Amino acid sequence: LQRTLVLIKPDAFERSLVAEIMGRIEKKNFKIVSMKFWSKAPRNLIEQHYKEHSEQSYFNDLCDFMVSGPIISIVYEGTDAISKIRRLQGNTNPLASAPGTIRGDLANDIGENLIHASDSEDSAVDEISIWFP
Amino acid sequence: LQRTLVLIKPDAFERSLVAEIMGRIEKKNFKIVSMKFWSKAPRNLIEQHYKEHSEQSYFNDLCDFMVSGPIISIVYEGTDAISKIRRLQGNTNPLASAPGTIRGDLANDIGENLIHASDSEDSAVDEISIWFP
Amino acid sequence: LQRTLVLIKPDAFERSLVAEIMGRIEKKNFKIVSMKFWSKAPRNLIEQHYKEHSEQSYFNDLCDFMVSGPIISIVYEGTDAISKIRRLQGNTNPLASAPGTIRGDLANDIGENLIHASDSEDSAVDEISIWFP
Amino acid sequence: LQRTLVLIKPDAFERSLVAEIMGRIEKKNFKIVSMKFWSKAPRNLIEQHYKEHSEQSYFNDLCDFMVSGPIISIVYEGTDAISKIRRLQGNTNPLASAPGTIRGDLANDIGENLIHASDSEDSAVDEISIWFP
Amino acid sequence: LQRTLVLIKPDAFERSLVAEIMGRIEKKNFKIVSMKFWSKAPRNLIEQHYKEHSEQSYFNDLCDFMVSGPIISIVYEGTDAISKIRRLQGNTNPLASAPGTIRGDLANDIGENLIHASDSEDSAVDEISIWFP
Amino acid sequence: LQRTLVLIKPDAFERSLVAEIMGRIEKKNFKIVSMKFWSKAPRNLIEQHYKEHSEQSYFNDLCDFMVSGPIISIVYEGTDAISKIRRLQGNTNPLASAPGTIRGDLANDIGENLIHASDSEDSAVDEISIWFP
Ligand SMILES: Cc1cn([C@H]2C[C@H](O)[C@@H](COP(=O)(O)OP(=O)(O)O)O2)c(=O)[nH]c1=O
Ligand SMILES: Cc1cn([C@H]2C[C@H](O)[C@@H](COP(=O)(O)OP(=O)(O)O)O2)c(=O)[nH]c1=O
Ligand SMILES: Cc1cn([C@H]2C[C@H](O)[C@@H](COP(=O)(O)OP(=O)(O)O)O2)c(=O)[nH]c1=O
Ligand SMILES: Cc1cn([C@H]2C[C@H](O)[C@@H](COP(=O)(O)OP(=O)(O)O)O2)c(=O)[nH]c1=O
Ligand SMILES: Cc1cn([C@H]2C[C@H](O)[C@@H](COP(=O)(O)OP(=O)(O)O)O2)c(=O)[nH]c1=O
Ligand SMILES: Cc1cn([C@H]2C[C@H](O)[C@@H](COP(=O)(O)OP(=O)(O)O)O2)c(=O)[nH]c1=O
Ligand SMILES: [Mg+2]
Ligand SMILES: [Mg+2]
Ligand SMILES: [Mg+2]
Ligand SMILES: [Mg+2]
Ligand SMILES: [Mg+2]
Numbered sequence: 001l002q003r004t005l006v007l008i009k010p011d012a013f014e015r016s017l018v019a020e021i022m023g024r025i026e027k028k029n030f031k032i033v034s035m036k037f038w039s040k041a042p043r044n045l046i047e048q049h050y051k052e053h054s055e056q057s058y059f060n061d062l063c064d065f066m067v068s069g070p071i072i073s074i075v076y077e078g079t080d081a082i083s084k085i086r087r088l089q090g091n092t093n094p095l096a097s098a099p100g101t102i103r104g105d106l107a108n109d110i111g112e113n114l115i116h117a118s119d120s121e122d123s124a125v126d127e128i129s130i131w132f133p
Numbered sequence: 134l135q136r137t138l139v140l141i142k143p144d145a146f147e148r149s150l151v152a153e154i155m156g157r158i159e160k161k162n163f164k165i166v167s168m169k170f171w172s173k174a175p176r177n178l179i180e181q182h183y184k185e186h187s188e189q190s191y192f193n194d195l196c197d198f199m200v201s202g203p204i205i206s207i208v209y210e211g212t213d214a215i216s217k218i219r220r221l222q223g224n225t226n227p228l229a230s231a232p233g234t235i236r237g238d239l240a241n242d243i244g245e246n247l248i249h250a251s252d253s254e255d256s257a258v259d260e261i262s263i264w265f266p
Numbered sequence: 267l268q269r270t271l272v273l274i275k276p277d278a279f280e281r282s283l284v285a286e287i288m289g290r291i292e293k294k295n296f297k298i299v300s301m302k303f304w305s306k307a308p309r310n311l312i313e314q315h316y317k318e319h320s321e322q323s324y325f326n327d328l329c330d331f332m333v334s335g336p337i338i339s340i341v342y343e344g345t346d347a348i349s350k351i352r353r354l355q356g357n358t359n360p361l362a363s364a365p366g367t368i369r370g371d372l373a374n375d376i377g378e379n380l381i382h383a384s385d386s387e388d389s390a391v392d393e394i395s396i397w398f399p
Numbered sequence: 400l401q402r403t404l405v406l407i408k409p410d411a412f413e414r415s416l417v418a419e420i421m422g423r424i425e426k427k428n429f430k431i432v433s434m435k436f437w438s439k440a441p442r443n444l445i446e447q448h449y450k451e452h453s454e455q456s457y458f459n460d461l462c463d464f465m466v467s468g469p470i471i472s473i474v475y476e477g478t479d480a481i482s483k484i485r486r487l488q489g490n491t492n493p494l495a496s497a498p499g500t501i502r503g504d505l506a507n508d509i510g511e512n513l514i515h516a517s518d519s520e521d522s523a524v525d526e527i528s529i530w531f532p
Numbered sequence: 533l534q535r536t537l538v539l540i541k542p543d544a545f546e547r548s549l550v551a552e553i554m555g556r557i558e559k560k561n562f563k564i565v566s567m568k569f570w571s572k573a574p575r576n577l578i579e580q581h582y583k584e585h586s587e588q589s590y591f592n593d594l595c596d597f598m599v600s601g602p603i604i605s606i607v608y609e610g611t612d613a614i615s616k617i618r619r620l621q622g623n624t625n626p627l628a629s630a631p632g633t634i635r636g637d638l639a640n641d642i643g644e645n646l647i648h649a650s651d652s653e654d655s656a657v658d659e660i661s662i663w664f665p
Numbered sequence: 666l667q668r669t670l671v672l673i674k675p676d677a678f679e680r681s682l683v684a685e686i687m688g689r690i691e692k693k694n695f696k697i698v699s700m701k702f703w704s705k706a707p708r709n710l711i712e713q714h715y716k717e718h719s720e721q722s723y724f725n726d727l728c729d730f731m732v733s734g735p736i737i738s739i740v741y742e743g744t745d746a747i748s749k750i751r752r753l754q755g756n757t758n759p760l761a762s763a764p765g766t767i768r769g770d771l772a773n774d775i776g777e778n779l780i781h782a783s784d785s786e787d788s789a790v791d792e793i794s795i796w797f798p
């Protein structure tokens with residue numbers, strides 16, 4: 001039994017894909033443990049969430065985008081939930097995300113990619129404490 | 134523009150229809166303005182929410198059901214959101230709800246009926262203040 | 267609790283709508299109690315099923331159509347299953363069936379209309395005994 | 400057999416509902432007989448199409464909207480295609496369109512209402528000649 | 533042209549996924565040759581079906597589960613139907629089943645995995661004779 | 666930013682999958698630049714489109730099939746659209762097309778495979794000029 005942190009990103013709201021994305025995780029039988037809606041996430045929370053990317057050239061564009069619209073943060077719970085939800089998510093790169101995955105079916109940009117999911121046990125605990133302190 | 138208060142009821146979680154219900158409202162182009170996940174709503178908020186029914190025969194069963202599992206409270210915003218979302222919802226009575234509506238398509242009980250929606254401008258304001266003080 | 271008799275008609279097989287139709291009933295929370303696949307229903311069961319129509323102008327065409335491909339006979343169970351499933355089904359006449367209903371959404375002919383559902387408690391009992399003796 | 404003229408309006412493109420709308424008509428078993436994609440319809444065809452409204456208060460806004468993005472013009476064919484597709488479409492007014500219909504499920508504005516469908520045999524013939532001379 | 537044996541397992545019934553699963557195979561254009569509904573399969577039929585697993589530690593839990601609710605057995609027919617339906621099915625292990633497959637989208641347990649499909653020509657003939665003697 | 670040429674093949678029309686296929690590309694956020702409906706494509710256009718296959722044993726059966734019903738030709742535009750739409754398409758061979766892809770979910774024949782998509786930059790320019798001279 002693991003908990004992972006999911007963000008529904010502003011592009012999901014703009015494109016009306018919130019339910020589509022949440023439904024894919026719901027149908028896989030993962031349960032919501034916590035959920036928070038953000039009309040606009042504070043930029044500092046975004047910078048902490050993406051602290052590992054602070055020196056990447058895309059960091060500021062990434063942060064601008066993540067504050068461009070609403071976000072839903074969700075803690076999902078289930079056996080091996082972290083790796084399983086990552087697999088549903090699909091690869092970051094639109095050249096690689098597989099059809100059948102969320103990004104593979106729905107995303108067409110490396111930045112505007114609809115959804116975040118924690119990539120490891122270590123980062124799950126981290127991100128959960130950022131969004132649900 | 135109006136805002137209306139929607140509850141996603143515990144039967145929706147039980148039957149994995151949370152995204153299905155939210156998706157129907159999303160596809161109608163209504164926007165989430167506020168949202169709260171409750172692992173178990175406090176009985177007092179429930180009795181307040183349904184205060185008009187407090188002397189009805191079904192009141193205790195209704196309150197019991199509403200705390201029997203998680204709920205999501207959502208404020209939706211759009212032109213004539215109250216009446217329009219009531220129409221999507223469908224009649225309380227499974228003998229009356231029209232196919233095409235949430236309850237008409239998905240609910241088969243007068244109590245376990247998946248979704249609450251505010252029925253008027255005043256009750257909307259009222260319910261919004263209960264779930265989002 | 268009632269039980270009603272449903273037939274999935276040969277046009278549903280032809281048009282690959284078998285799961286679509288069964289799915290609408292399933293999502294309404296009705297339970298399969300009995301089920302039979304017929305690669306070709308015996309003409310005699312069909313004439314019995316539709317005995318009320320035996321003197322109508324359309325009778326032979328109706329019987330011919332009903333043996334023109336496979337059918338599935340299903341007994342569904344739930345509260346007020348008969349009337350409720352009739353409502354999902356929709357009007358026989360394509361000029362009358364409401365969007366949201368099976369026929370309203372999917373059928374475009376008064377004969378090739380995808381689904382049979384028992385129309386009363388007595389006809390349900392009757393039809394159930396024909397298809398599941 | 401009748402033929403009717405359908406326009407998929409620019410809001411459908413904006414909201415990525417082109418296939419959703421065409422799919423509802425396709426599932427009803429109506430056949431495309433003619434089809435034209437317009438990156439931007441010529442204003443003159445639009446004013447001709449809506450000539451009956453030329454003196455109405457909303458005319459300029461309607462014409463402006465109709466050239467604000469792409470449209471698809473389609474001629475559909477089937478028994479009673481005109482009235483049947485009008486029924487799928489739903490009422491122009493978002494306070495009136497029934498869930499189950501295209502507009503009832505998907506539109507939330509009296510102007511930005513996703514789809515045009517010919518309203519009579521004569522207007523069908525008329526509109527067909529405008530979009531497919 | 534091959535025939536393969538599919539079981540819709542009790543968890544599909546509990547979770548109301550019967551049509552969803554059958555629809556996926558139907559949409560791939562496989563035809564039903566035989567179909568049998570079982571309110572509860574006899575435990576001995578289950579033990580024969582899984583005779584190859586008799587010495588596995590999960591054998592009794594597996595059999596208990598397979599008699600815990602209804603089952604539908606289906607013989608599907610089509611070119612290379614055995615391998616193709618296996619690929620739609622997805623891997624047994626929730627850590628491996630690919631999004632886009634039945635288990636990959638819908639199953640989250642190695643035991644409660646919704647669907648059985650024969651794994652070879654040799655086992656297809658075998659299983660078909662168990663369920664359709 | 667690339668443009669690729671897509672054909673919706675006659676089997677999509679016969680099976681009523683036109684919207685399903687177009688919707689998959691639409692949901693991935695690709696935009697239509699040009700679209701042409703063909704009640705029946707001229708055989709010579711088909712032979713040019715498939716000129717690379719002229720010496721294959723399946724060439725004449727392929728051409729017969731492509732003129733057996735309507736076709737929609739579409740020019741889609743987007744970043745890396747050629748390779749991305751190929752990946753959504755899925756492999757030609759029903760033994761290999763992956764679930765989640767168009768062919769993987771929907772096609773069951775190596776010839777009747779629903780959709781063409783240009784395989785390279787060189788062939789995109791070529792095919793676009795054949796269908797949209
Ligand atoms: C690698 C990369 C990421 N990003 C953005 C989008 C990613 O969701 C976010 C974090 O990157 P990363 O953690 O690599 O992606 P993922 O979300 O798949 O774990 O940074 C870019 O905008 N451009 C890039 O090249
Ligand atoms: C009228 C009624 C309501 N209820 C429950 C279900 C309703 O969702 C809740 C409030 O009733 P009500 O406000 O009448 O219905 P709605 O939810 O359609 O606005 O009380 C019953 O259980 N039995 C009943 O007879
Ligand atoms: C009334 C009628 C029925 N039929 C066929 C189609 C009906 O499904 C079948 C039985 O008719 P009926 O019991 O009146 O319709 P329903 O199936 O809605 O209960 O007979 C015709 O072909 N033409 C007709 O005019
Ligand atoms: C009546 C009306 C129409 N319109 C626009 C939207 C309609 O699609 C278009 C033509 O009106 P109309 O033909 O009355 O509606 P429909 O599209 O349902 O046949 O004009 C308005 O913007 N406001 C209005 O009050
Ligand atoms: C391998 C395995 C199977 N099972 C159950 C679920 C499987 O559907 C069933 C048969 O196993 P197997 O034939 O290996 O799986 P599949 O259904 O993918 O062909 O046994 C377990 O409960 N635990 C296990 O570790
Ligand atoms: C390879 C092959 C193709 N075809 C037909 C179907 C293909 O869509 C068409 C062109 O072949 P090809 O370009 O190899 O396939 P794709 O469409 O995946 O790029 O020729 C056959 O009928 N049989 C075959 O063995
Ligand atoms: Mg990461
Ligand atoms: Mg109320
Ligand atoms: Mg009848
Ligand atoms: Mg009009
Ligand atoms: Mg096996």
Ligand SMILES: [Mg+2]
Pocket residue numbers: 782783784
């Ligand atoms: Mg090719």
